[PDB]
Amino acid sequence: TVASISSGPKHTQKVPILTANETGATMPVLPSDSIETRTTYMHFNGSETDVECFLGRAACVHVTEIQNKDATGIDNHREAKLFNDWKINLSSLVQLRKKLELFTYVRFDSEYTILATASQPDSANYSSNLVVQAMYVPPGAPNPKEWDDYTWQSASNPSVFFKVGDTSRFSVPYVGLASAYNCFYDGYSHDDAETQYGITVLNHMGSMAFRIVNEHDEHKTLVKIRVYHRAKHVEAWIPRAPRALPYTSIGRTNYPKNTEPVIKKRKGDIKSY
């Protein structure tokens, strides 16, 4: 492939460099339309800018935490982090979010990876070996209440059991209602005068539930869960302007008030170098 062809002096009536940008086109002008060039080859394919590659590496999408401790006398397991759910979403952490929102609709399979590490912040004789259970409680399913509900039987709901310190990995097909995931949605769930606005009203993929299967030892053990997400088989439509201001909420486009100028001011003139 040639990156530049050889081109010499020109004295024409045919001027490729004068255009009318009002038309909305970006005319494909090249170095050889306005200087004299020599042949050179590309030596490159643009492999690593493919959208599959761009969205295809694992990104941290969520960090939560649960603890193993005596539940005796706990009136609210959920509240003691005896167990914890995660109303699943990808808008939480901003790194991957800015990348996805370069597109309007996106479609891809997900390959999640869950790392769990334990901490024992206060005096323990040892480090116990805990098994985590991660169970996907899709919408319309019983929601745990206690850390050892009938729920956790999860006879019809996919669940994975792995050890703290290890990692669990499993992918799931693209479970969108539509043909693709909306990255934006300028609508409502119905014509209500007070119903929410935006994506949130589409993001309804349930929540992920985590718990330790082990009963309690004499000390307490903090287990912190990190969920990583990798898109595989990516398809993206309609590019948009990149995010400039900071994010404030999962699912709304809102930016913070009295934010700071995002364009760097010159130290000098327009004329400055």
């Binding site: 045919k14 001027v15 490729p16 004068l18 255009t19 009318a20 038309t23 909305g24 086109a25 970006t26 005319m27 494909p28 002008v29 339309d33 394919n45 643009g46 492999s47 493919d50 959208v51 599959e52 590659c53 295809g56 399979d109 992918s171 799931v172 097909p173 693209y174 595989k232 088989h233 990516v234 590019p239």
Partner: protein, 40 residues
């Protein structure tokens, strides 16, 4: 070799090697030729 039955379980896809910027760079209704005048 796929070891698994479902398609979601296969590895990453392989390069589009599609590439056609004209839907974005030249969505004009009447074709523009480089070198010919923009507005006639």
């Amino acid at each position: 070799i796929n070891y698994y039955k479902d398609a979601a379980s296969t590895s990453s896809a392989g390069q589009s090697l599609s590439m056609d910027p004209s839907k974005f760079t030249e969505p004009v209704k009447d074709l523009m030729l480089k070198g010919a005048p923009a507005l006639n």
